[PDB]
Amino acid sequence: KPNYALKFTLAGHTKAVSSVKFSPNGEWLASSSADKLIKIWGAYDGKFEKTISGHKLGISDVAWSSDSNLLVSASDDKTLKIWDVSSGKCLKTLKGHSNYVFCCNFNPQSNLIVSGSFDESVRIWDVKTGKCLKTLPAHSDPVSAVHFNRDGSLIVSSSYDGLCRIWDTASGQCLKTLIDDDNPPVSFVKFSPNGKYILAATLDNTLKLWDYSKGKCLKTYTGHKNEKYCIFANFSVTGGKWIVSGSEDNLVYIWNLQTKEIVQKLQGHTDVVISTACHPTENIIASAALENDKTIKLWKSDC
Amino acid sequence: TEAARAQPT
């Protein structure tokens, strides 16, 4: 079992925090918020570094480029923005969605961005020009998450329509739809580090690990509360192999990936833990909470 | 203002 202990509390957003992400090089944490701002913090000391501004409405997601130099953000103002982190300047505004942009990610190559929106579509964008390269009629409800696999050759998308779908990045063709009985709303999805599985959250207090090519569900993680919000989950791989998720009972849950036992609950936030992130090289977790809290917390463990 | 992820279904 891990022994995550609270190390820092990062105050400063003036509304709910929506997403936190460590930079691929481990140096930084980026956070997004309903207060329309992105903030950058030191990953190891929690020190505030800068505020990044320009979205016209609140922001639901942020993600880093592979060289840790760019951010992309997804906003209720129906745009994404690409930012130079060092200068804080907006480099490109990606327009084309017709409703809130909810989720975003770069591919490992970081020449593409993928976005999902309340307009039920997934768009794929050229990082260098800002042009929209593909528009996918991906779902019949808001797209809650989009993620590239480890070589950028596939995209997974999830939606309130209850589906996860696997897309061929090059062709835009849908290669697999994952269904599960009554198909409750899928509120999060991401590929596993080895690209063979997907971890999907549904709004019935459940996380599932799927082999998407075999269509088999391999593990189920529960005990937390998730019926209303699109809460990020993670694979933690720097020490022991854990699953990490926020929860609507205001805790961070940590499960053993193989046994599905809850191995730790992290207490400190005073509102829904909407987002967690795992540091790329150290056993460090960042967690972020909604309106009655507005803070980010950094936790550190020996395994 | 507000962000869609910070609002409940």
Radius of gyration of chain A: 17 Å
Number of spatially distinct domains of chain A: 1
- CATH architectural label of chain A: 7 Propeller
Would you report the number of β strands of chain A? 28
Which strand order does the major sheet of chain A show? 1-28-27-26
Topology-level CATH name of chain A = Methylamine Dehydrogenase, Chain H
Q: For this structure, what is the CATH class of chain A?
A: Mainly Beta
End-to-end C-alpha gap of chain A: 7 Å
- Helix/strand-derived category of chain A reads mainly beta
Oligomeric status: homodimer
Number of helices, counting only DSSP H or I runs of 4 residues or more of chain A: 0
Compressed to H and E, one letter per element, the order of chain A equals EEEEEEEEEEEEEEEEEEEEEEEEEEEE
**How much strand content do the residues of chain A show?**
over 45%
Form type of chain A = globular
Which percent range fits the helix content of chain A?
A: under 10%
Question: How many strands, what sense, and barrel or not for the largest sheet of chain A?
Answer: 4 strands, antiparallel
Q: Name the CATH superfamily assignment of chain A.
A: YVTN repeat-like/Quinoprotein amine dehydrogenase
GO cellular component, one term (chain A): MLL1/2 complex
Subcellular location (chain A): Nucleus
Organism (chain A): Homo sapiens (Human)
InterPro entries (chain A): G-protein_beta_WD-40_rep, WD40/YVTN_repeat-like_dom_sf, WD40_repeat_CS, WD40_repeat_dom_sf, WD40_rpt
